[PDB]
Symmetry: C5
Subunit: 27 residues, 5 copies
């Protein structure tokens, strides 16, 4: 169940990577 | 098992998006 | 043992990325 | 198993993160 | 191999802190 959190964390990193990308476009 | 597969997926997605960032800073 | 370290680091990378998103929206 | 992929992808991400560093410096 | 996963993870946080410094540098 330690793995569950790693899996939820990678998913967030993928969302956070996208907003960073979108923002750079907004520049 | 099913959870290593998810990580490997996500890692794949991450590398693809780190690359996008890199090409965007390169560009501008 | 190393599993929990990994889980720590990941939560951290989330907050750091998350922090990065705040700097970008700042200017 | 797949750990060869995680390892590699991590290995690869530091590469890509090092590059981001270079381009914020050199730029 | 885990160490590699543990070493690289450590390394990324530094590299991010490193990137956050440069964005807070200019």
């Amino acid at each position: 169940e330690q793995l569950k959190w790693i899996s939820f964390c990678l998913f967030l990193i993928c969302l956070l990577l996208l907003c960073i990308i979108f923002m750079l476009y907004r520049g």
